[PDB]
């Protein structure tokens, strides 16, 4: 991993030692080249996972998440340029450094071999995330959004820290490979049931689980666009990735311990998807859509089947690209009229025909049109849950209906109908903006062509 | 569509609107023109027999009973002109009614394909800019003292003045835009 | 009642402007200024480009990438009737019995 991490660290001096007129062109270009180098992790010609050293590894679960992380950094930079163009030069460089910091921290997080190392990097990400939300968010509610985000995470993370220390005191190590091979059955004591919850809650809050999700709609509505991109695409996946790594040592208590969280997720995914039908704020709508999708990820990880893990891995990647695309699409209208109210701008297909095409594909991805990886992940999750209990299809069926309703509702409301023609400041789409949309959507199509790369650990 | 409605409909207005609806729904029932013409004349005779009712209170009661009768004898699926509200072609061309301010974003290579059109458009923009201040002053001058106000707008009284708030009416897209 | 004398005047002034705006929408002769074999042959040349050439590519893929892999092209078996000859072997299928015939 050092041949990926070291060049990423060199982006920081590159940012600060570049001329003001070359900073964006420089950092974006090398960020693309670093994404290219991360593809080396996909050269996997056997079934032994790559252990580069005692500290860094990569297997079929972390490899897609590392590459998606590397790809997001250039995309976030392009997304940020227009709304930062009034900041002075030092403030622009500070913002870029925050974005690089997350890229470095997240790549290290997904390749860490030891759980307290994962925990430290997992917690470190809050610092640049909070700074981005609160220093560059637009509204007065960005400060409250920062508090919710930081402290929903932290209250769950403290029990996680206790559990990790406890496991290490008992086993002698937090190395993941050794924990895997030497794992032994747990007794079903009250003490072990609290251990299960301490190991799971921080990851479940991060997903977020329905019930403790209020931080996420707040954080998205208030964050700048690059903050929304990283939060929806990668940061939520830390919880799902954490749950998959740590659940190997929690057997057999997950068989009964999972029931309340399957119930919250399967019912909760209907509550949050139905909220999207009556949401007046476009960013909030996309955010609630994420909570509904991540509810599926929670359910499939909880039932721990080969299909359920594979469907969760695909959905994690597919949602990452799709939701980041939707935030970028919404931000392009906001940068023109400076409102997130969905019903304000209307008939936009009349004036932005190619941007409306990007809107349609993002919406078709979101409602899981086959053969997209969006549908493939949701399909295999549905099959595994049906096996777990045939009555799950009732709640799946309701969510599928509602997801089509709000996905097409967003398109009809904003792109169709009569143009709101008092909006004479609807400047034509930027080349940068149209390029940004394509950089989301080409990988989604390419991954649909070769879905072996995101199947995860079980297939 | 061109004239704003008043605060309330006078008794005469309500009667004449029922008359137009009643005939139109009769036409939907009859279909055939000879049959419709026969019953259209019978319908007019019913409005005539009470034309000279001077009671008012009886006239208002006669309007009530006719409207109740209309709702019961209403055609469930009345004929609608294709371009009217509820018609099949209603709002069919709205996706083609591009506002004129879109041309302000055309590229110079796009504008160079209509050198004559964009010269005339400049004259219309210059005319618009010069007239605005006078238009605003006229509306301010012609405000009534008592608060009672309506949506009707005044004409241009002087010479060289354009009627106030004309740009959104005069330059609106064509009905059949393309 | 009809238009008030003010409504009549306003509609006249707008009518003069609107009809001038609509006249202005006409294009001049030079606008738009744009910068600069028998029948059946057109049916022939379309066939070569959009039937013959793609059929070479599809036939190549079918012959040398699909027919060379197991079970990629699986047909149901042809019908064999009493009295046929099988080319692969040469065997002749025995005829059927006798019914005996019947008349409607």
């Amino acid at each position: 991993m050092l041949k990926i991490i070291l060049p990423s660290l060199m982006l920081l001096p590159l940012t600060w030692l570049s001329s003001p007129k070359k900073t964006w062109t420089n950092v974006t270009s090398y960020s693309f080249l670093i994404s290219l180098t991360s593809l080396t992790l996909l050269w996997q010609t056997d079934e032994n996972y790559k252990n580069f050293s005692n500290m860094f590894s990569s297997d079929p679960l972390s490899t897609p998440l590392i590459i998606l992380t590397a790809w997001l950094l250039p995309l976030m930079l392009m997304a940020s340029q227009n709304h930062l163009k009034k900041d002075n030069n030092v403030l622009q460089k500070l913002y870029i450094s925050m974005l690089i910091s997350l890229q470095i921290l997240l790549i290290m997080t997904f390749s860490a071999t030891e759980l307290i190392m994962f925990y430290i990097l997992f917690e470190a990400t809050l610092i640049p995330t909070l700074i981005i939300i609160t220093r560059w968010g637009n509204q007065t509610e960005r400060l409250n959004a920062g508090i919710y985000f930081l402290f929903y995470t932290l209250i769950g993370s403290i029990p996680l820290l206790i559990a990790l220390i406890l496991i290490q005191n008992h086993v002698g190590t937090l190395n993941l490979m050794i924990l895997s091979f030497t794992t032994h059955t747990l007794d079903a004591s009250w003490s072990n049931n609290l251990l299960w919850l301490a190991c799971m809650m921080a990851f479940l809050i991060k997903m977020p689980l329905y019930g403790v999700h209020l931080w996420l709609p707040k954080a998205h509505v208030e964050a700048p666009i690059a903050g929304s991109m990283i939060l929806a695409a990668i940061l939520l996946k830390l919880g799902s990735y954490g749950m998959i790594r740590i659940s190997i040592i929690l057997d057999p208590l997950t068989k009964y311990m999972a029931y309340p969280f399957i119930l919250l997720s399967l019912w909760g995914m209907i509550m949050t998807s139905s909220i999207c039908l009556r949401q007046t704020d476009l960013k909030s709508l996309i955010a609630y859509s994420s909570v509904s999708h991540m509810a599926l990820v929670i359910a499939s990880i909880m039932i721990q089947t080969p299909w359920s893990f594979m469907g969760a891995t695909m959905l994690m990647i597919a949602h990452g690209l799709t939701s980041s695309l939707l935030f970028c699409l919404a931000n392009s209208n906001y940068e023109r009229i400076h409102s997130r109210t969905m019903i304000m701008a209307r008939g936009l297909q009349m004036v932005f025909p190619l941007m409306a095409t990007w809107w349609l594909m993002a919406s078709l991805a979101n409602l899981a049109l086959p053969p997209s990886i969006n549908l493939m992940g949701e399909l295999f999750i549905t099959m595994s849950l049906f096996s777990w209990s045939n009555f799950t299809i009732i709640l799946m069926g309701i969510n599928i209906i509602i997801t089509g309703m709000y996905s097409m509702y967003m398109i009809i409301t904003t792109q169709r109908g009569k143009l709101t023609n008092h909006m004479i400041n609807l400047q034509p789409s930027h080349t940068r903006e149209l390029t940004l949309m394509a950089l989301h959507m080409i990988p989604l199509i390419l991954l649909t062509t070769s879905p072996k790369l995101i199947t995860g650990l079980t297939m | 569509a061109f004239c704003a409605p008043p605060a309330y409909l006078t008794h005469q207005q309500k009667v004449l609107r029922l008359y137009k609806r009643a005939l139109r729904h009769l036409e939907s029932w009859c279909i055939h023109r000879d049959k419709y013409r026969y019953f259209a004349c019978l319908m007019r005779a019913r409005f005539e027999e009470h034309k000279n009712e001077k009671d008012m209170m009886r006239a208002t009661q006669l309007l009530r009973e006719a409207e109740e009768e209309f709702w019961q004898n209403q055609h469930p699926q009345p004929y609608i002109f294709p371009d009217s509200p509820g018609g099949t072609s209603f709002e069919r061309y709205e996706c083609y009614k591009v506002p004129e301010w879109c041309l302000d974003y055309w590229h110079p290579s796009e504008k160079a394909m209509y050198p004559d059109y964009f010269s005339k458009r400049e004259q219309w923009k210059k005319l618009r800019m010069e007239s605005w201040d006078r238009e605003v002053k006229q509306l301010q001058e012609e405000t009534s003292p008592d608060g009672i106000m309506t949506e009707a707008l005044p004409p241009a009284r002087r010479e060289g003045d354009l009627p106030p708030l004309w740009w959104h009416i005069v330059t609106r897209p064509r009905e059949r835009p393309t | 009642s009809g238009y008030t004398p003010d409504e009549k005047l306003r509609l006249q002034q707008l009518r003069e402007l609107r009809r001038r705006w609509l006249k202005d929408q006409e294009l001049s002769p030079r606008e738009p200024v744009l910068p600069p074999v028998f029948k059946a042959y057109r049916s022939s040349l379309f066939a070569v480009s959009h039937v013959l050439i793609p059929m070479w590519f599809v036939h190549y893929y079918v012959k040398y990438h699909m027919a060379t892999k197991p079970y990629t092209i699986v047909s149901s078996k042809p019908r064999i009737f009493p009295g046929d000859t099988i080319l692969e072997t040469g065997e002749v299928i025995p005829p059927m019995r006798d019914f005996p015939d019947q008349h409607h």
């Binding site: 004036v351 | 591009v98 974003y105 590229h107 059109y117 835009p177 | 929408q25």
Partner: peptide
């Protein structure tokens, strides 16, 4: 036959 200008958004970009 008269040809009229068709108003469109800027499709250059």
């Amino acid at each position: 036959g008269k040809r009229l200008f068709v108003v469109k958004p800027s499709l250059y970009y």
